[PDB]
Structure 1
Amino acid sequence: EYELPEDPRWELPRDRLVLGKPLGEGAFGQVVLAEAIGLDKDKPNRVTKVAVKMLKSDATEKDLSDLISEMEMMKMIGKHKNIINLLGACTQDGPLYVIVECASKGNLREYLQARRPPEEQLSSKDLVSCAYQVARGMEYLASKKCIHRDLAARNVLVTEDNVMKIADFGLARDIDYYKKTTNGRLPVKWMAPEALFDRIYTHQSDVWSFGVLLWEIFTLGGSPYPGVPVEELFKLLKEGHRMDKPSNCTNELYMMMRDCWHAVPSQRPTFKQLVEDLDRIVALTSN
């Protein structure tokens, strides 16, 4: 059981919502595509495709509290082009539905892969642009005290008009480093040393992630530290080994990666900086 308070800024009548296909039961919760009717006073007879999150029926009291949390946090953080945004919620006379934006070309990684050489092909500008947009989004969240914790291509989603949007930021978390993702990869490959070892998570480690995220981008979908089992990665990093520069990657960019991977967290750049460098570099980068 439960009753929620309703904020009318955000309440959508649940009959204005046409639920459709699901897509995986994530880290608690389960999400389904849907069509919202209205959403906009201007054009109230238009459907808008949205993603709607709701509880599975095998759902604890906390599992709920969690959903309410991340909803309320998405409210606090506010809108930005380069993040997945809240658009509404259905709170009354039914189970809770937390509606957000549909990003119609999947995750960054899938979209990169689908655009390798012999569905279109990405120019050099198209890639740096992509890194730039993620940095913007990251900067925004950071400006709002948000620390991401699992930043990587899989957690960047892409809209029809090709805009990078960061996903799963307000995320309530709690520990197997062998836990495999859908694609078969290990979340530790994105983790900064101090996050790995001493559980210390900050903007600085979100920057380390962004390093690897750049690496993913300039390998059109790469898989980090290829065939280097978890155990080995412990040492390699400890000592100071770093990933290899990709082909089709300028020294400039490879040097960014390397600063995002500074051993001393405080000496890494910040997103503010990285946005400013990526803007310049995009302007100097040819189609």
Structure 2
Amino acid sequence: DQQYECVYGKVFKARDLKNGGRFVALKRVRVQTGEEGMPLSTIREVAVLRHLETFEHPNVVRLFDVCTVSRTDRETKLTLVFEHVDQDLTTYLDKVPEPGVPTETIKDMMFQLLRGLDFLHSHRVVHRDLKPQNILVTSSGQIKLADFGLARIYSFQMALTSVVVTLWYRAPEVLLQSSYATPVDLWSVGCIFAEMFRRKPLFRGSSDVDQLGKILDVIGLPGEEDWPQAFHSKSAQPIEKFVTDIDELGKDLLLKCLTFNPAKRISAYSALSHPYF
């Protein structure tokens, strides 16, 4: 706000007056003066970040401040500043030379992104919005989980709204309007995994109903005991047909994350204990 120059709101990267022209990314959150105070999310978002900040976990973005300038004239405005990073896992791919990232640069990020995820879960936090747009990439190739405004502390018998993750990266459980939990991040991972080996969203879809099938046409059709007769019974067509250029190990990893029954779907913890690494 006061000493900040910017080169539900726009994500403007900016340079702070204090630090050596440092880059303090600004996320000006808008608070429509209706009747509810600070946006419900811009709170849980900063809440979780402020809570776990003392651990300074490598694979997580760093929040610096929440300006907030009260205005007697018009409504107040929010200046949410984090640490600046060059490109989101998306950009990196749109501009990554052919053929995309190397089986090594790929294996790394997946280890990190999965590492930070493992961390986040240990503190009962479920970041419910994992997508390329929400991952960050340091110029040196490190991962930073971001846009935490969907993440929340998950506790037993907690109430839930089955509206998690952007259509594409949504896990089966959240599409069938059923109950969800942590595996919601592992699935959202498999997707981001496949989407690296081949800079293209493994499960594009138009509706929830459609989003489910596209996913079913790829991973196949689970049994009765892996289901919480609508969709079809087609033989899961080898993934090597959907994700181009993948190791035999990585093969297993993606099929460990993109499992239907979340009760089986590998955990961020052991996923790091997986051979592919």
- What is residue 48 of structure 1 aligned with on the other side? 22
Give, in whole Å, the separation in 2 of the partners of 1:68 and 1:227. Answer: 31
TM-score of the two chains, using structure 1 as the length reference: 0.72
The correspondence for 1:222, drawn from 200, 210, 216, is 200
- What is residue 9 of structure 1 aligned with on the other side? none
Does residue 52 of structure 2 align to residue 72 of structure 1? no
Give, in whole Å, the separation in 2 of the partners of 1:147 and 1:260. Answer: 16
Does residue 92 of structure 2 align to residue 111 of structure 1? yes
- What is residue 111 of structure 2 aligned with on the other side? 132
Distance change >3 Å, CA 89–CA 58, structure 1 → 2: closer
Give, in whole Å, the separation in 1 of the partners of 2:9 and 2:44. Answer: 13
TM-score of the two chains, using structure 2 as the length reference: 0.75
Give, in whole Å, the separation in 1 of the partners of 2:69 and 2:133. Answer: 33
Does residue 82 of structure 2 align to residue 85 of structure 1? no
For this pair of structures, how many residues does the alignment match? 242
Structure 1 position 30, deviation (Å): 3.3
Structure 1 position 158, deviation (Å): 1.1
Partner SS state of residue 263, structure 1? coil
C-alpha contact (below 8 Å) 2:43/2:149 kept by paired residues: no
Distance change >3 Å, CA 60–CA 172, structure 1 → 2: farther
Give, in whole Å, the separation in 2 of the partners of 1:88 and 1:98. Answer: 6
C-alpha contact (below 8 Å) 1:148/1:169 kept by paired residues: yes
Distance change >3 Å, CA 226–CA 55, structure 1 → 2: closer
Structure 1 position 222, deviation (Å): 1.3
Name the one with the larger helix percent: 1
Letter in 1 for 2:17: I
Structure 1 position 128, deviation (Å): 0.3
Letter in 2 for 1:37: L
Structure 1 spans left out of the alignment, 5+ residues: 1-13, 22-27, 39-43, 178-185, 283-287
- What is residue 97 of structure 1 aligned with on the other side? 79
- Spell out, residue by residue over 1:81-104, the C-alpha distance to the aligned partner (whole angstroms, 9 max, x if none): 112111123245664322101111
Among all aligned residue pairs of Structure 1 and Structure 2, give the percentage whose two residues are the same amino acid: 24
C-alpha contact (below 8 Å) 2:175/2:208 kept by paired residues: no
- The CA RMSD over aligned residues, in Å, is 3.1
